[PDB]
Design a protein around this ligand. Structure first.
Ligand SMILES: [Mg+2]
Ligand SMILES: [Mg+2]
Ligand SMILES: [Mg+2]
Ligand SMILES: [Mg+2]
Ligand SMILES: [Mg+2]
Ligand SMILES: [Mg+2]
Ligand SMILES: [Mg+2]
Ligand SMILES: [Mg+2]
Ligand SMILES: [Mg+2]
Ligand SMILES: [Mg+2]
Ligand SMILES: [Mg+2]
Ligand SMILES: [Mg+2]
Ligand SMILES: [Mg+2]
Lengths: 218, 55, 51, 129, 100, 88
RNA sequence: GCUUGAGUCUCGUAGAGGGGGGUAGAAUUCCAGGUGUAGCGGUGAAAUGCGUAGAGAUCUGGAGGAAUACCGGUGGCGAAGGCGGCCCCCUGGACGAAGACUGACGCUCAGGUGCGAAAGCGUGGGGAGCAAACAGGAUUAGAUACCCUGGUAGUCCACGCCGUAAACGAUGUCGACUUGGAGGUUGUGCCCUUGAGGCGUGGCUUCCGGAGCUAACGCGUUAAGUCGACCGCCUGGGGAGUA
């Protein structure tokens, strides 16, 4: 049944009453979530997740923190999937139409990186323009092209991603997310208990989500 | 504490001058800081402890 | 209060007085009676001393 | 003070409901029961339960349908400070007809639909919808 | 019947009227069917500040069980007597022996 | 506020037996007791305004209790006030 | 009739809860004396004041009244007012742990009754410090003030009046119900007491915050949320809490 070796639970006091039903913890000043209730939430989780991924999966593996950002620009990034691994530039969904050209400048630039003007102008402008592009790259990588409108959303840490999720809620976008003992649920349709800032429950489920979009209907 | 006659245990809850030392410094509990003071005030009255360091 | 300082030195060494008396209970008792207004004082001394 | 228990029922409900509380209990009585009945028989609660003898205990199982609580509102209407009584023709109908009014009569605690058919009337205990 | 501590301190120049006093106060309490759960003639002791001119004065401890009546007239006898430079009858809650 | 010896004595003078402590008549009597005891405390002092509040409480408590009994068993009421000596 | 609502009973606990009496040290003022000598005191600066009859400074003895430093703390008690040295006596309430007793005896309460800071009044005391009034010295254009040097009622005690305060949490009392978090304080059960603790279980209290409520600020299990019983009060500002 279990597969999460050592993600057991996490998070001490800072608990959110509403996250009681998914708790059975009480180990030394910290809750262990209800392991045996998290897995029935891979059922439903990766299910309506894939059930749409074959209907065609457009995702947004949204998850930040200089401590798991790169481990999101991964097979999470790779597949039928888009992502954000830095500061969730607010209104990026709700104001996509303004931000849509924050994109044109990323391309119309890199498309021009080993092309267009580049080694020319000044060797001032140079890295003094790749700073324009470096900045853009993180926070606005995964976006690059959005071909199929943001369709579901998968987030690592419910509340830490206040804004992201809120926006979804506003635009009618499923929001699949894992929620720590401390975080507010109910912002999340398909809620996933368990730790949300340890190198494992990430990768595990993260990489496990990459494994279900990346395959649904050949 | 338990007793005002304990001047020995008591003389480590007062300064050179003889001022009671606040619970905050000694880290005592509430219920006892009072028992402490009272025992001190007793012993001062019975000339078992100076009110003052003016002698 | 008391420093019975001994042999090899010339300096005052009485940092003692900045541990109790002087501007302590002295600046205190020097003036306006107070009464119920220290209560208003010390009521800010905890609102402060909470953090 | 304990003075009005029927409001307490109506309320313990109203409250617990709003607290998405599974069940709820309280001191029982002939009267509390007759209503817990109509409440169930009209399908505002799952099912009641009286578990005692010397100190009886009414227990109601609450219901939640969509995400909401089933009982959208529950008010007193008569009360010690001010008793209400309606004749048959003057009986009230809640939410135009949806939801109901609990009226005690010379032939027992029954709804407004009920008492209206029975061709009588009594003390209108409370409103539910 | 209640208890009390009690601890009168006497003027040096009246030192050996202490045996007579103890003798007296106990004869007094015993007399009224009261026990006496501790006794301690601390003798001449040095003072923590000079009280009344003169330093060093003769202490006496007691721990009695006796009725609010003899304990009354004690406190007075203590006043009447201008040889007992201090005195203080105290709490109670149950007898006591040894300490000090 | 009255003695265990004394309070006991009266339970045992008024109730069915020691243990029948909460009998109307007993309460009333052990109140009535403390009231009258007190009459001499407030004889001196008098300005013991605070303690006084407690004493009235005792009277108004007793008063309601006496009222109860009367309604219940009138027979027991009259005996009581006679024996306790009040209600001139 | 019933026992959970309300009482009574038992042993304890904490407390500036009240009333009375006793007592302690520190300082101030004053009185007396040693030493000592021209200043001290006060302000923004001054002056008035005080000192050559020796001031202030210092030391010693004494008288008197008033308040209780340190403890002391969003600490504690009380219905509110409001209650802080220590000790005894008298006394009110609250809380906890066991079970035993009464058996709806309860909640509220117009009228009524009691209590009720400070000031103020009446007779007698009492008077160190403080200080309305008043006097003097200054500041100012003026200065009936703020500042200074003085200082009477008063501030203290008993007895009796007065009955008001932003007397406020500006939030009436009682009861039932409704996510949480970190403290403070006070009982009590259990755990190799083997840790200065470990886990529970009541009373009171502070901060923060969820629903919900609000005009908003904010309140939020100590409600300003959800309901009930009863009482008090509001109905534009001014006139007027006046006639
Ligand atoms: Mg003196
Ligand atoms: Mg002197
Ligand atoms: Mg008591
Ligand atoms: Mg009065
Ligand atoms: Mg007055
Ligand atoms: Mg007068
Ligand atoms: Mg003046
Ligand atoms: Mg008024
Ligand atoms: Mg207040
Ligand atoms: Mg709050
Ligand atoms: Mg709380
Ligand atoms: Mg309310
Ligand atoms: Mg008038």
């Amino acid at each position: 049944m279990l597969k999460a070796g050592v993600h057991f639970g996490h998070q001490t006091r800072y608990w959110n009453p509403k996250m009681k039903p998914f708790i059975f913890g009480a180990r030394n000043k910290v809750h262990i979530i209800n392991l045996e209730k998290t897995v029935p939430m891979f059922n439903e989780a990766l299910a309506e997740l894939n059930k749409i991924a074959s209907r065609k999966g457009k995702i947004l593996f949204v998850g930040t923190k200089r401590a798991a950002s790169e481990a999101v620009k991964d097979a999470a990034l790779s597949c039928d999937q888009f992502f954000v691994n830095h500061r969730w530039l607010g209104g990026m969904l709700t104001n996509w139409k303004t931000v849509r050209q924050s994109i044109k400048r990323l391309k119309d630039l890199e498309t021009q990186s080993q092309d267009g003007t580049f080694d020319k102008l000044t060797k001032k402008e140079a890295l003094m323009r790749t700073r324009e592009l470096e900045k853009l790259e993180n926070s606005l990588g995964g976006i690059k092209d959005m071909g199929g409108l943001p369709d579901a959303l998968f987030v690592i840490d419910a509340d830490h991603e206040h804004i992201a999720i809120k926006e979804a809620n506003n635009l009618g976008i499923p929001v699949f997310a894992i929620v720590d003992t401390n975080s507010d649920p109910d912002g999340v349709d398909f809620v996933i208990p368990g730790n949300d800032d340890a190198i494992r429950a990430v990768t595990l489920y993260l990489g496990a989500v990459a494994a279900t979009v990346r395959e649904g209907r050949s | 504490e338990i007793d005002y006659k304990d001047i020995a245990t008591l003389k480590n809850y007062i300064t050179e001058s003889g001022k009671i030392v606040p619970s905050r410094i000694t880290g005592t509990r509430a219920k006892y800081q009072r028992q402490l003071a009272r025992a001190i005030k007793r012993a001062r009255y019975l000339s078992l402890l100076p009110y003052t360091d003016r002698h | 209060i008391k420093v019975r300082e001994n042999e090899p030195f010339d300096v005052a060494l009485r940092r003692f007085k900045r541990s109790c008396e002087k501007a302590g209970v002295l600046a205190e008792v020097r003036r306006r009676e107070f009464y119920e207004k220290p209560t208003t004082e010390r009521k800010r001394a905890k609102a402060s001393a909470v953090k | 003070s304990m003075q009005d228990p029927i409001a307490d029922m109506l309320t313990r409900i109203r409250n617990g409901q709003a607290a998405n509380k599974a069940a709820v209990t309280m001191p029982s009585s002939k009267l509390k029961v007759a209503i817990a009945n109509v409440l169930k028989e009209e399908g505002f609660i799952e099912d009641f339960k009286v578990e005692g003898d010397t100190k009886p205990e009414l227990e109601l199982t609450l219901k939640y349908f969509q995400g909401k609580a089933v009982v959208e509102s529950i008010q007193r209407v008569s009360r010690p400070g001010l008793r209400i009584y309606k004749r048959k023709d003057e009986l009230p109908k809640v939410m135009a007809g949806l939801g109901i009014a609990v009226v005690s009569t010379s032939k027992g605690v029954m709804t407004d639909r009920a008492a209206r058919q029975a061709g009588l009337g009594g003390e209108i205990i409370c409103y539910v919808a | 019947m209640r208890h009390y501590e009690i601890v009168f301190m006497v003027h040096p120049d009246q030192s050996e009227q202490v045996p007579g006093m103890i003798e007296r106060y106990t004869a007094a309490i015993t007399g009224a069917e009261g026990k006496i759960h501790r006794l301690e003639d601390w003798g001449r002791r040095q003072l923590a500040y000079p009280i009344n001119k003169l330093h060093k004065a003769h202490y006496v401890l007691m721990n009695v069980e006796a009725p609010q009546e003899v304990i009354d007239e004690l406190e007075t006898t203590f006043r009447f007597n201008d040889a007992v430079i201090r005195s203080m009858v105290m709490r109670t809650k149950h007898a006591v022996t040894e300490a000090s | 506020s009255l003695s265990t010896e004394a309070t006991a004595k009266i339970v045992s003078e008024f109730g069915r037996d020691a243990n029948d402590t909460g009998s109307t008549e007993v309460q009333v009597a052990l109140l009535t007791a403390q009231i009258n005891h007190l009459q001499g405390h407030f004889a001196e002092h008098k300005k013991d305004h605070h303690s006084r509040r407690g004493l009235l409480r005792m009277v108004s408590q007793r008063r309601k209790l006496l009222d109860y009994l009367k309604r219940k068993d009138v027979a027991r009421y009259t005996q009581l006030i006679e024996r306790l000596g009040l209600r001139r």
